[PDB]
CSV table of C-alpha atoms and ligand atoms in Angstrom, one decimal:
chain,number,residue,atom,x,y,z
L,1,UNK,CA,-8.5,43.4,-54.2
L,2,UNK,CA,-11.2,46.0,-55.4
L,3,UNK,CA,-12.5,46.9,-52.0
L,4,UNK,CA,-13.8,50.5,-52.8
L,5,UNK,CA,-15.4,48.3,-55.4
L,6,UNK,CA,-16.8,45.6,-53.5
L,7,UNK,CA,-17.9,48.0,-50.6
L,8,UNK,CA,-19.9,50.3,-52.7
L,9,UNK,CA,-21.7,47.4,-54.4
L,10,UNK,CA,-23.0,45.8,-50.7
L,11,UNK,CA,-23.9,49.2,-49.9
L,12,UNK,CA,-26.0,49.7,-53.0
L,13,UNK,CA,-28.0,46.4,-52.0
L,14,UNK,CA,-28.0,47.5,-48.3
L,15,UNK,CA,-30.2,50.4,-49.2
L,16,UNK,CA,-32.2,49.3,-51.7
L,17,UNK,CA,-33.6,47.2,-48.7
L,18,UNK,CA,-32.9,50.2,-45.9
L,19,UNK,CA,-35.9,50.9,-43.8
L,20,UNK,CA,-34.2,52.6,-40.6
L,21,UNK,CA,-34.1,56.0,-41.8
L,22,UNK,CA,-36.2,57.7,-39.1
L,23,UNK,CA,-33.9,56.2,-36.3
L,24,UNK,CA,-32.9,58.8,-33.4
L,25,UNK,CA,-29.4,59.6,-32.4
L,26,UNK,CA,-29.5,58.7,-28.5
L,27,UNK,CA,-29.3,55.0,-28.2
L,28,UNK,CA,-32.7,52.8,-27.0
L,29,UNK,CA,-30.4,50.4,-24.8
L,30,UNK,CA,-28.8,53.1,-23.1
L,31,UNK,CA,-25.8,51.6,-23.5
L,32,UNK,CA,-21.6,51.8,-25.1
L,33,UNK,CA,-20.1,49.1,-25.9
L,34,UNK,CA,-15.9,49.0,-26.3
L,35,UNK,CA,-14.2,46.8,-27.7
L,36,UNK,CA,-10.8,45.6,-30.3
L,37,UNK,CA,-11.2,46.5,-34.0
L,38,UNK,CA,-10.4,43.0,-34.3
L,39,UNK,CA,-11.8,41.7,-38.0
L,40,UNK,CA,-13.4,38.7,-36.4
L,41,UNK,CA,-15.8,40.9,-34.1
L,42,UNK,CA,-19.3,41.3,-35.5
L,43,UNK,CA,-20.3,43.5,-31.9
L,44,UNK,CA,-24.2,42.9,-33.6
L,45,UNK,CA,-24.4,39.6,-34.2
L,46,UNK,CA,-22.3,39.1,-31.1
L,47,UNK,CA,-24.6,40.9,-28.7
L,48,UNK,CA,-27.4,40.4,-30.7
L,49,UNK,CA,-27.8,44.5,-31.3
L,50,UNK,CA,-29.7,46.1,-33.9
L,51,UNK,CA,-29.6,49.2,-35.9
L,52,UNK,CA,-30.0,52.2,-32.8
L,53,UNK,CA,-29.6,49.5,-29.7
L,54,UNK,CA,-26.0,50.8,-28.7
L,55,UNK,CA,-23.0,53.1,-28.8
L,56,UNK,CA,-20.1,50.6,-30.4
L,57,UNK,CA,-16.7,52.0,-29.7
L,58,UNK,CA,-13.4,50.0,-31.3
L,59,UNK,CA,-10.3,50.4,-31.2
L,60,UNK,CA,-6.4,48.8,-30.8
L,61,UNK,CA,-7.0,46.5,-28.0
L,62,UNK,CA,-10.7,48.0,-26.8
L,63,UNK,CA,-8.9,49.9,-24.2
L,64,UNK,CA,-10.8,51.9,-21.9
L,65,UNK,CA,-8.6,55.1,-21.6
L,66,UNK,CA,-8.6,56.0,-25.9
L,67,UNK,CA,-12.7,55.3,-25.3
L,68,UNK,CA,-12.9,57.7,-22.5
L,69,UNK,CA,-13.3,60.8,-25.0
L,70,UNK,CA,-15.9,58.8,-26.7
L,71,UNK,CA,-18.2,57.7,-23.8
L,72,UNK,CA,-18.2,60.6,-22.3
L,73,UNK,CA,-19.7,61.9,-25.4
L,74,UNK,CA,-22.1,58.8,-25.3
L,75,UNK,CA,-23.2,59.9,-21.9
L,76,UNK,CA,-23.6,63.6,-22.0
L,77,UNK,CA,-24.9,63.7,-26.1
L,78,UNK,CA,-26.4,60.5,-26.1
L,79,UNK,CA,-27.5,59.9,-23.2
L,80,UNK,CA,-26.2,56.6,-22.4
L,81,UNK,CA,-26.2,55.1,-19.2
L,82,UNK,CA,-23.9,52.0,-18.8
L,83,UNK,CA,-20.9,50.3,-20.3
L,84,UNK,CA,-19.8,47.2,-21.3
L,85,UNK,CA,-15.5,46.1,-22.1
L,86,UNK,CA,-15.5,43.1,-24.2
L,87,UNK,CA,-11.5,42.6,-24.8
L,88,UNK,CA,-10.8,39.0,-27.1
L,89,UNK,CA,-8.5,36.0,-27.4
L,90,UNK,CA,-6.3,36.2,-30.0
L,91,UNK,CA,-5.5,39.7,-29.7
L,92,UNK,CA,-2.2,41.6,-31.2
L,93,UNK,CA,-2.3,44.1,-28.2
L,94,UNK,CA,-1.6,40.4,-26.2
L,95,UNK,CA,1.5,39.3,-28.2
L,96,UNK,CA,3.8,42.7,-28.6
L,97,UNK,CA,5.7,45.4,-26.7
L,98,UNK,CA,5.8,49.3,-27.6
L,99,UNK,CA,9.7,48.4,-28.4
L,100,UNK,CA,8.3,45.3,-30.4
L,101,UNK,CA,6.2,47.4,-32.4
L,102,UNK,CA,8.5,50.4,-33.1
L,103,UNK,CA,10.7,48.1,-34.9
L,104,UNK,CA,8.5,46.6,-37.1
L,105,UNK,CA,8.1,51.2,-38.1
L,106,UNK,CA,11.8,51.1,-38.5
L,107,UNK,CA,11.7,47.9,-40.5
L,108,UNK,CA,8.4,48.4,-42.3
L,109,UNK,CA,8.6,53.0,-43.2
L,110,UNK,CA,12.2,53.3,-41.7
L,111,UNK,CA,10.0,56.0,-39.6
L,112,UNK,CA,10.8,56.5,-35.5
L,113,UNK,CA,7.4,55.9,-33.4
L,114,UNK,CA,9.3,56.7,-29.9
L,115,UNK,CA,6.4,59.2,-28.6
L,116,UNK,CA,3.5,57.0,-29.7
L,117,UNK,CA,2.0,55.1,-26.4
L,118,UNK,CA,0.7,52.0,-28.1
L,119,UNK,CA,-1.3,50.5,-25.0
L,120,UNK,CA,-0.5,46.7,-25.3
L,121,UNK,CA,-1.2,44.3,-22.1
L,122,UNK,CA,0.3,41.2,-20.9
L,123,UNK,CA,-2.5,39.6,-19.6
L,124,UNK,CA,-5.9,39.2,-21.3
L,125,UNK,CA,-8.2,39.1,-17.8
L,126,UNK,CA,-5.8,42.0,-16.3
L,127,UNK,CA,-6.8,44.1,-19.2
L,128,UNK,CA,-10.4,43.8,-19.1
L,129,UNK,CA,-9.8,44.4,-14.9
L,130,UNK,CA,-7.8,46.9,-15.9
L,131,UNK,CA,-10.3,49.1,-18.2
L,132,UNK,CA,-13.2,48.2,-16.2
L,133,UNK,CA,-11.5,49.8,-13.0
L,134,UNK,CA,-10.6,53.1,-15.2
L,135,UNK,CA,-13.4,53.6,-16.1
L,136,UNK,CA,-15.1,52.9,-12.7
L,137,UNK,CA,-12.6,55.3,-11.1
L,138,UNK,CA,-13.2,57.9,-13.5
L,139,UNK,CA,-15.0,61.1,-12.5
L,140,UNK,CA,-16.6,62.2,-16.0
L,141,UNK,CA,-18.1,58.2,-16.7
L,142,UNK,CA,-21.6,57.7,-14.7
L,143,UNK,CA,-23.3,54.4,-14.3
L,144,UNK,CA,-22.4,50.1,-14.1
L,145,UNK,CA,-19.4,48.7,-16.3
L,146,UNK,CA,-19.7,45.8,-17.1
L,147,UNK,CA,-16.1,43.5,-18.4
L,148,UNK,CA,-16.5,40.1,-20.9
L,149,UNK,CA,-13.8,38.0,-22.8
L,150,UNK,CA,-15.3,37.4,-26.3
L,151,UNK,CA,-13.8,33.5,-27.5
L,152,UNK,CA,-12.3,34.1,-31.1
L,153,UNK,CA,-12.1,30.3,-30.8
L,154,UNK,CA,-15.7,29.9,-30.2
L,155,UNK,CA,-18.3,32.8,-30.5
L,156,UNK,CA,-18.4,33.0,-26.8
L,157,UNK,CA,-18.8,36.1,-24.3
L,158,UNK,CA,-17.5,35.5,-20.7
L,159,UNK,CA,-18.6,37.7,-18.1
L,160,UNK,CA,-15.5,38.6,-15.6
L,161,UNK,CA,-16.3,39.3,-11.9
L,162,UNK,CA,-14.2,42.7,-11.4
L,163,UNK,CA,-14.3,43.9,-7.6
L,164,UNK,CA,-13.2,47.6,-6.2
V,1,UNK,CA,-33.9,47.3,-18.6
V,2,UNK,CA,-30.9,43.9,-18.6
V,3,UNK,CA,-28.7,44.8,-20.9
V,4,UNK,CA,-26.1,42.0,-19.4
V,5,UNK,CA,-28.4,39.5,-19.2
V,6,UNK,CA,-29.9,40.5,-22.6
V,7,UNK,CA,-26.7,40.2,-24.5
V,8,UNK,CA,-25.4,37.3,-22.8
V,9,UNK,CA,-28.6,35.0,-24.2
V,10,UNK,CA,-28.4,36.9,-27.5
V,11,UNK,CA,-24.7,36.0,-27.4
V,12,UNK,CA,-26.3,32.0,-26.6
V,13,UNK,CA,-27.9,31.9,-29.7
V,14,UNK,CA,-24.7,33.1,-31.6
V,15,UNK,CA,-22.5,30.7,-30.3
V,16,UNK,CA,-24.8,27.7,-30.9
V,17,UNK,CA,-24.9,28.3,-34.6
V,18,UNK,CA,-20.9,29.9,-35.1
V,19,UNK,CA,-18.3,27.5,-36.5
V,20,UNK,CA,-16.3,30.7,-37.8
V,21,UNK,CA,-13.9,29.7,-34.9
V,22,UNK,CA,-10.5,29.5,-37.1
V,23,UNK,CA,-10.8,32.5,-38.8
V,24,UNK,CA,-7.3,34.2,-38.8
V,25,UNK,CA,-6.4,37.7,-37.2
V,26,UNK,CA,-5.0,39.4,-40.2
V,27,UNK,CA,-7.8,40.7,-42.1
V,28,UNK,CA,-8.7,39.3,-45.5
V,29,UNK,CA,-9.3,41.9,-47.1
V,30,UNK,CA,-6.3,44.1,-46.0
V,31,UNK,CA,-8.6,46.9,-45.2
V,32,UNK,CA,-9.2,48.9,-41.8
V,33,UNK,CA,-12.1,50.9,-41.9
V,34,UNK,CA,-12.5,54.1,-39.3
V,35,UNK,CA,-16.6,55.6,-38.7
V,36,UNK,CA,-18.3,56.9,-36.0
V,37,UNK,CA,-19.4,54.5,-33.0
V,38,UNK,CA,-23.3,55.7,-34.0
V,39,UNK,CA,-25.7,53.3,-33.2
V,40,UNK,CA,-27.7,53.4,-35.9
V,41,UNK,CA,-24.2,52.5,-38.3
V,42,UNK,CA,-23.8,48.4,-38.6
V,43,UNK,CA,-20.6,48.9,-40.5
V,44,UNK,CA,-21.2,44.6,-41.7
V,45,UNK,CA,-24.3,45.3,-43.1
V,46,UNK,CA,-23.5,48.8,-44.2
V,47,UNK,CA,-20.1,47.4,-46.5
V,48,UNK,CA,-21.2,44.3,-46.8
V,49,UNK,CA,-18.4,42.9,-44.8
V,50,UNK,CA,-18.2,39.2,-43.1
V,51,UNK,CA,-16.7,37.8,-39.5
V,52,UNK,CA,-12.4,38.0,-40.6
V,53,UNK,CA,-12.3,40.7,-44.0
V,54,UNK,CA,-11.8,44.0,-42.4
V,55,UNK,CA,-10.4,45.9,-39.1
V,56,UNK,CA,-13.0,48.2,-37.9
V,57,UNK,CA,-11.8,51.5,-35.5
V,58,UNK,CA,-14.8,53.3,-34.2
V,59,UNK,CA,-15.0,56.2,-32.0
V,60,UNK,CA,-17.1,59.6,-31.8
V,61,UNK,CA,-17.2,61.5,-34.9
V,62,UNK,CA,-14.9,58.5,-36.5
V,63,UNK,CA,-11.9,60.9,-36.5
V,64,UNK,CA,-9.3,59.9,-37.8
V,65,UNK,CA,-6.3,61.8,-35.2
V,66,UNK,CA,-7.5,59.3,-32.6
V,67,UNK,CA,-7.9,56.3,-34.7
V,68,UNK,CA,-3.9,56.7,-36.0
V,69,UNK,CA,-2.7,54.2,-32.8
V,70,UNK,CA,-5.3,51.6,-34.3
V,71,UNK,CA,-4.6,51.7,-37.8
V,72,UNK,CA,-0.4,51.9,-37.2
V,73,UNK,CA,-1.2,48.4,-35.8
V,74,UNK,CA,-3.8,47.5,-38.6
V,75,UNK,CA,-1.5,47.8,-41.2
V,76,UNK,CA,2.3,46.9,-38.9
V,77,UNK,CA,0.5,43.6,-37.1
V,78,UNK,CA,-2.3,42.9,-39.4
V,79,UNK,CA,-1.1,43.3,-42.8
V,80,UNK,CA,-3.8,45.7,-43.9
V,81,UNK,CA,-2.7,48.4,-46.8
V,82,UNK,CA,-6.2,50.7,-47.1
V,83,UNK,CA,-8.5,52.7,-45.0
V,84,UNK,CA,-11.5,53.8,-45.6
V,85,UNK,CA,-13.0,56.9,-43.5
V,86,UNK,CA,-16.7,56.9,-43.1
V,87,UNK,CA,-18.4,60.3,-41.4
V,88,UNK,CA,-22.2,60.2,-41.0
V,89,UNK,CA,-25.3,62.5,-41.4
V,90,UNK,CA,-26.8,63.7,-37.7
V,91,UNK,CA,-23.7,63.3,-36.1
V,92,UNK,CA,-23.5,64.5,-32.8
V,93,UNK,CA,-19.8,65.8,-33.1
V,94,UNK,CA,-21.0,68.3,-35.9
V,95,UNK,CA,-24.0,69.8,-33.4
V,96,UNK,CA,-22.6,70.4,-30.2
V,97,UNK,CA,-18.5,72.5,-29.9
V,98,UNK,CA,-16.0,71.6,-27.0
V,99,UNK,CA,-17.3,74.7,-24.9
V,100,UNK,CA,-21.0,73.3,-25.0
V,101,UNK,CA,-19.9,69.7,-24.4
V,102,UNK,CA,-17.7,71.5,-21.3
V,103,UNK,CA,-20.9,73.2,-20.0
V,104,UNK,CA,-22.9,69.8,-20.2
V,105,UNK,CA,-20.1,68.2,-18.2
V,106,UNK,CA,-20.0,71.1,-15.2
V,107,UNK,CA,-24.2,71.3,-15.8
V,108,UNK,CA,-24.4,67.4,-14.9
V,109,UNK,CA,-21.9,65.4,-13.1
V,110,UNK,CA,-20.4,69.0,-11.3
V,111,UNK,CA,-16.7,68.4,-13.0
V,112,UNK,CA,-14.1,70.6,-15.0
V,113,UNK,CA,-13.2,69.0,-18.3
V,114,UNK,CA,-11.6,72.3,-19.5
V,115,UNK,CA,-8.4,70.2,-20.8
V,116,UNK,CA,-10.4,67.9,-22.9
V,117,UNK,CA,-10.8,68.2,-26.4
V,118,UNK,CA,-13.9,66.0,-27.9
V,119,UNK,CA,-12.6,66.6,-31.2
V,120,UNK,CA,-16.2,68.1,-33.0
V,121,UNK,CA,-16.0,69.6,-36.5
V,122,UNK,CA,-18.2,72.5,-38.2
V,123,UNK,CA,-19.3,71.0,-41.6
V,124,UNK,CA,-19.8,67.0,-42.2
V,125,UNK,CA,-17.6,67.3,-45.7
V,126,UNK,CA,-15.1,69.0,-44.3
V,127,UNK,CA,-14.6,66.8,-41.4
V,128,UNK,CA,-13.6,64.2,-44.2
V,129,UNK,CA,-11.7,65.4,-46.2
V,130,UNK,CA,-9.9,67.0,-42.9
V,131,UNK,CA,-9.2,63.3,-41.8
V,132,UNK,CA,-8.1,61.5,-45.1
V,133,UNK,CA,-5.8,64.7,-45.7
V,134,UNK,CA,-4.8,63.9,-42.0
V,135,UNK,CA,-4.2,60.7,-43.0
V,136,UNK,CA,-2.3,60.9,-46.3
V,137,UNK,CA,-0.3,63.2,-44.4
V,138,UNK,CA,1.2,61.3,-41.5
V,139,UNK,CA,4.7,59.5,-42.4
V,140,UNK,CA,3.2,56.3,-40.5
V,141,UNK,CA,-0.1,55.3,-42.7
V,142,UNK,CA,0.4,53.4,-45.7
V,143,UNK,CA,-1.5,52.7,-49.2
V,144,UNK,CA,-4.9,54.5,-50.4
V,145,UNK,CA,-7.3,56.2,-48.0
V,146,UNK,CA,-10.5,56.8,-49.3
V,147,UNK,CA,-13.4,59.0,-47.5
V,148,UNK,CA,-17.5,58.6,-47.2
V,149,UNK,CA,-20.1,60.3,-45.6
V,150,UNK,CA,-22.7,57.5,-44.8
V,151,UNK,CA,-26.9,58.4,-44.8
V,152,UNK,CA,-28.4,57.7,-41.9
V,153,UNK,CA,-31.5,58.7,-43.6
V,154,UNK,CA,-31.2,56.0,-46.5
V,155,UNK,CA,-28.4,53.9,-46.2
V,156,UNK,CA,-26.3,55.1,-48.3
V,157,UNK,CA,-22.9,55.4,-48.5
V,158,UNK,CA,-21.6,58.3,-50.8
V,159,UNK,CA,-17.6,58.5,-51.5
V,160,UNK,CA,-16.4,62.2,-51.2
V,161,UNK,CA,-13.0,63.5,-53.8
V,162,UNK,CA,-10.6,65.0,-51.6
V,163,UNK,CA,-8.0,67.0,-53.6
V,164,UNK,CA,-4.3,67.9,-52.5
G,1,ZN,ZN1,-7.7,42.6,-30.6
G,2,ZN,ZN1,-21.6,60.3,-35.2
């Protein structure tokens, strides 16, 4: 309940300690990572990254078409070479609708949200299929992607097979 | 030279020590936080945040236009009520303009990208107080938004005053 607070105080300890400082932009593994903004996500600890290892792109879901802007940036300025779609159990962009949404707006900030596209999906492994394809398909994205299902439940990344 | 088969043994030795497995989705600390997908950026060690307090949106340049679909769901499915925006020093988005990221595109891969825009800014201050304004502004974004430029020299994590 005093997270400015709180946050600046971690920070102050992070850099007392903070060695990193000569790091280079372009990252070592060559590599982006997208995935949900979900709170229970760690990407580092999950993937066992460090400070300059990857690219780590989050957002509403991980969906590949909002991370397009952004890896194509981590390709062409950072020189990235590969990508990997980690989408989770226990997602929010599983269990509601556009129209779902929209009404908790109206009910919520009595605001109207009918032009926002808020890319839900209706099947976890159809999602990561889904983005991997996209981004496969694109023109402007070079190199393997890679799709996982990371186990709230569990700590767990599962590799999918995605063909075509 | 792996990167899947790197991350999936890192991701062994994560799950064989987690037990954070009930966690909830709604983030304890009703904050979403929105940076910069950097590498070099670990936003839990950087806030000192833990596995379930925070929603974390990250994309290039950590803009905060893009990252409104994310935090509308934050705060209308996840209960959050603050954001904090977190810009960084050596940012690629500040360097490089959306003609030069064009040319890299035609110079490289041989496509048009003439009807993207990457969303770069001029001056790293700037760019923040841009995006909380941005933010404070839209009918659709509740509670306090507070804005940082983070060190990647030392660590640090500096809060800017943004007037209006
Ligand atoms: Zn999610
Ligand atoms: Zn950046």
């Amino acid at each position: 309940m005093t997270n400015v607070a709180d946050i600046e105080a971690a920070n102050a300890q992070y850099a007392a300690a903070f060695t990193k400082g000569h790091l280079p932009g372009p990252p070592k593994r060559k590599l982006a990572v997208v995935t949900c903004m979900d709170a229970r996500i760690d990407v580092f600890s999950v993937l066992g990254l460090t400070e300059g290892d990857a690219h780590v792109i989050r957002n509403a879901g991980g969906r590949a078409s909002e991370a397009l802007r952004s890896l194509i940036i981590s390709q062409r300025l950072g020189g990235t070479e590969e990508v990997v779609v980690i989408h989770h159990t226990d997602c929010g962009m599983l269990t509601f609708s556009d129209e779902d949404i929209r009404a908790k707006i109206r009910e919520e900030l009595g605001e109207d949200a009918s032009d926002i596209k808020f890319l839900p999906f209706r099947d976890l492994e159809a999602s990561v299929r889904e983005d991997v394809r996209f981004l496969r398909g694109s023109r402007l994205v070079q190199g393997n992607v890679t799709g996982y299902v990371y186990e709230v439940e569990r700590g767990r990344l599962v590799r999918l097979d995605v063909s075509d």
